């Protein structure tokens, strides 16, 4: 299986989504025209995973852009790689979702969703062998969160044997738009637990902290946060995009990473951590990459890895380096810290190497972990949800769109089940 269909929803979804296509396009040698101007053949070998060929010979991203507002999509279209997207893959309403999950999922989103599925079907039909879908969205707003999870439900109904994966941005009070973000996040998680196969948890708390503590940026913008996201995203999709042995498609990644169907929320990690523009001149040694990629301070989800156990780990090393030194360092980490890797999944750490480094670095490592420490992320959202929900505060925004309190109670309970299910395996 080859083709992945990419969907980006809402302001956050479309902003990280645009950056993703920007970064991977440069790696595959594709320019704003859709014209290849690269040297290596490794660049084109698996280009069909993400790109359509339309005679030119031009490469068109298999990408559908979705919003309930036109704003951020006009931003994308007049942005750097804006011309590359298929204009018919732009699907927008006018009325917005007002950071309201109920509007995205039930009222405004319901009005727009069929048009999105027409574009999904049109893209799915040109595929030799569709692998499945990736979605970029946030959980804190209304469109990416409410409408994004509506879309996932409808995509699963029409394609139940395909893999569904998400890059899901979790909200934090540190970088926050509205007080209702915990409501929107809890309702979205409930969906994600049932209808995705694999979810990369991108924690805005973590991205903020990395920017503040490590990159010495005193006031991080979304741009700074998204630079970390696009690097992580390029990293986690390396094995899908380039010639390679393991985690080479979406189903094989799921089979190695997900021991129990509900526990499919991954903590990504990246090394070296770099800020935008400002370059680093000294390449990292393989021992340094390996130490940094496993460091809590390189994690994109604000969870302490020492507070849990790793179920499974995938590690991707990028650049020209010694594969023998990689195996040794990877083996050294596990042997040194063996109590943090569950002993009932043997050889639960898999490593891949790709020759092509990302732009502006000679060496990089990407970490994908399924840790039971992710539970800290869900506990945090749960705490914020309950603080409001016990006084039913802000609920009228949701009941006004037809929702009952019961739906909140159920979504909370399911998220608490997920928490305690993680705790079960951290002690087994």
């Amino acid at each position: 299986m080859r083709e992945i269909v990419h969907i980006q929803a809402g302001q956050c979804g479309n902003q990280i989504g645009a950056k993703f296509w920007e970064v991977i396009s440069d790696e595959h040698g594709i320019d704003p025209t859709g014209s290849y101007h690269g040297d290596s053949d490794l660049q084109l070998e698996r280009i069909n995973v993400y790109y359509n060929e339309a005679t030119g010979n031009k490469y068109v991203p298999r990408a559908i852009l979705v919003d309930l507002e036109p704003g951020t999509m006009d931003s994308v279209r007049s942005g750097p790689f804006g011309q590359i997207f298929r204009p018919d893959n732009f699907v927008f309403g006018q009325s917005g979702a007002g950071n309201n999950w109920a509007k995205g999922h039930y009222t405004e989103g319901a009005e727009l969703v069929d048009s999105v599925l027409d574009v999904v079907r049109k893209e799915s039909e040109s595929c030799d062998c569709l692998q499945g879908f990736q979605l970029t969205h946030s959980l804190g707003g209304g469109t990416g969160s409410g409408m994004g999870t509506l879309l996932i439900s409808k995509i699963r109904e029409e394609y139940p044997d395909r893999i569904m994966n998400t890059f899901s941005v979790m909200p934090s009070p540190k970088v926050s738009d509205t007080v209702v973000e915990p409501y929107n996040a809890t309702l979205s998680v409930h969906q994600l637990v049932e209808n995705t196969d694999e979810t990369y948890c991108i924690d805005n708390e973590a991205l903020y902290d990395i920017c503040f503590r490590t990159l010495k940026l005193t006031t991080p913008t979304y741009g700074d946060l998204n630079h970390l996201v696009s690097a992580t995203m390029s990293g986690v999709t390396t094995c899908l995009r380039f010639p390679g042995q393991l985690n080479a498609d979406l189903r094989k990644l799921a089979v190695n990473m997900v021991p129990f169907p509900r526990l499919h929320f991954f903590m990504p990690g990246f090394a070296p951590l770099t800020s935008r523009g400002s370059q680093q001149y000294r390449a990292l040694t393989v021992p340094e990459l390996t130490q940094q990629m496993f460091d809590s301070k390189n994690m994109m989800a604000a969870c302490d890895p020492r507070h849990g156990r790793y179920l499974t780990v995938a590690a991707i090393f990028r650049g020209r380096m010694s594969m023998k030194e990689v195996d040794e360092q990877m083996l050294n980490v596990q042997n040194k810290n063996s109590s943090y890797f569950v002993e009932w999944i043997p050889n639960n750490v898999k490593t891949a190497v790709c020759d092509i480094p990302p732009r502006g670095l000679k060496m990089s490592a990407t970490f994908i972990g399924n840790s039971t420490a992710i539970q800290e992320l869900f506990k945090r959202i749960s705490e914020q949800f309950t603080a409001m929900f016990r006084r039913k505060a802000f609920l009228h925004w949701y009941t006004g769109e037809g929702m009952d309190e019961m739906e909140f109670t159920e979504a909370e309970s399911n998220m608490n089940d997920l928490v305690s299910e993680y705790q079960q395996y951290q002690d087994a």
């Binding site: 006018q94 950071n99 509205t178 603080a387 505060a393 802000f394």
Partner: protein, 440 residues
């Protein structure tokens, strides 16, 4: 798209309308004839200022606004005055006989004669909108038209436009400029009647504004003109997010999400800074930290009450002009380790911030200094309930004797509308107390 229609009701609504619209024209470079040279798209457009102005084929930019008074003399001043070419005659609606400081007359006797005509003129503005967001209603609490007609109009708009948002700018009465003994009655009757029909209401206490004018601007005896110029600055700060765009601009609707935790709890406290004379601004720049600090000084509030003695449920800062997030965050961090800011336990404590880059404008001949940066804080505090407690007390003193009640009964109202309106106010005061109690 996102159009907003303004409705200015009665003397106070209308005169505040004049001030706001004059100021909007200066903010966007629109001339008194409606021409705006900088607007290259003739007869239409989807720019930010189009939320408030429509455009004719001849290049005229026209307020999306209706002015309504039951008497003709305040609206005749708009008709013959500086900005008379701005408005199509059909946007300015007058009767002949006013409500004589009586809510019953504004709501029933006189107002029922003109209500169908007003809703027809509103309908004509709405029909020109491609994506109508909602209404901004300007009125006094104390006047007969401002209270009775506004409450009638709000009820009817709920019928004709469903749940389309309605925001109020409501002039709360003060003894220094008030014109009727019965203003406490009119205030309680309108507040009870419109409470279910309104999404958000900005109360402007005429005494807070009178004090600020006397104290900060050194005006011995402020007139309506003084008060209105300052009110328009505050209204402008609130609507600036709708009328301009920019990277760090944050839409009013998004502040509203944070500001209204329960439908009845919908009365934000506005505080504005800096209010300073030309004489004192000279050579003295107010920094971001200075203006943000001034937001937590109670003498700068639009309603007299003390937030230090209640609890916060939300805090929003709307900056305009030369302001960057770095400085905002530094100023906020200082204030947090130095001020009396206690939140209820059920809401998070982070301040929500928007910045518009376009700096404040002042009107020629006015009293305020042209500054490089300004701020409007909108907070949701339990302290706003003090303003209700004061009006309710005044209402109770007169109502226990039925003083002036015959004027309302003579117009067809029953005593049961009074006790009912009063009970709703008692329940509102109670609601404000309950939201400030800690959780179990």
């Amino acid at each position: 798209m996102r159009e907003c229609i303004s409705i200015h009701v009665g003397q106070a609504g209308v005169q505040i309308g004049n001030a706001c619209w004059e100021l909007y024209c200066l903010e966007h470079g629109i001339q008194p004839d409606g021409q705006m040279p900088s607007d290259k798209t003739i007869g239409g457009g989807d720019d930010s200022f189009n939320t408030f102005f429509s455009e004719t084929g001849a290049g005229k930019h026209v307020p999306r606004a209706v002015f309504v008074d039951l008497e003709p003399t305040v609206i005749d001043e708009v008709r013959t005055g500086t900005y008379r070419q701005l408005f199509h005659p059909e946007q300015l609606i007058t009767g002949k006989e006013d409500a004589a400081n009586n809510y019953a007359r504004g709501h029933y006797t006189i107002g029922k004669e003109i209500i169908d005509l007003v809703l027809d003129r509103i309908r004509k503005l709405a029909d020109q909108c491609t994506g109508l967001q909602g209404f901004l209603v300007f009125h006094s609490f104390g006047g007969g038209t401002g209270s009775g007609f506004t409450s009638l109009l709000m009820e009817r708009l709920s019928v004709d436009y469903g749940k389309k948002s309605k925001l109020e700018f409501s002039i709360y009465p003060a003894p220094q400029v008030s014109t009727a003994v019965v203003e406490p009655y009119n205030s309680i009757l309108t507040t009870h009647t419109t409470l279910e029909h309104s999404d958000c209401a900005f109360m402007v206490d005429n005494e807070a504004i009178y004090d600020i004018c006397r104290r900060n601007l050194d005006i011995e005896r402020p007139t309506y003109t003084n008060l209105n110029r300052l009110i328009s600055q505050i209204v402008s700060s609130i609507t600036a997010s709708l009328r301009f765009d920019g990277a760090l601009n944050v839409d009013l609707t998004e502040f509203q999400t944070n500001l209204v935790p329960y439908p009845r709890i919908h009365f934000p406290l506005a505080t504005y800074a800096p209010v300073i004379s030309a004489e004192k601004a000279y050579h003295e720049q107010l920094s971001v930290a200075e203006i943000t600090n001034a937001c937590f000084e109670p003498a700068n509030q639009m309603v007299k009450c003390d937030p230090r003695h209640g609890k916060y449920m939300a805090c929003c800062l709307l900056y305009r002009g030369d302001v960057v997030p770095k400085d905002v965050n530094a100023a906020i961090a200082t204030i947090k380790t130095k001020r009396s800011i206690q939140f209820v336990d059920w809401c998070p404590t982070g301040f929500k911030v928007g910045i518009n880059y376009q700096p404040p404008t002042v009107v020629p001949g006015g009293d305020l200094a042209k500054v490089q940066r300004a701020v409007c804080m909108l907070s949701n505090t339990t302290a706003i309930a003090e303003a209700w407690a004061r009006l309710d007390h005044k209402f109770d003193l007169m109502y226990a004797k039925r003083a002036f009640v015959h004027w309302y009964v003579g117009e067809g109202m029953e005593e049961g509308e009074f006790s009912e309106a009063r009970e709703d106010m008692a329940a509102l005061e109670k609601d404000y107390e309950e939201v400030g109690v800690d959780s179990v």
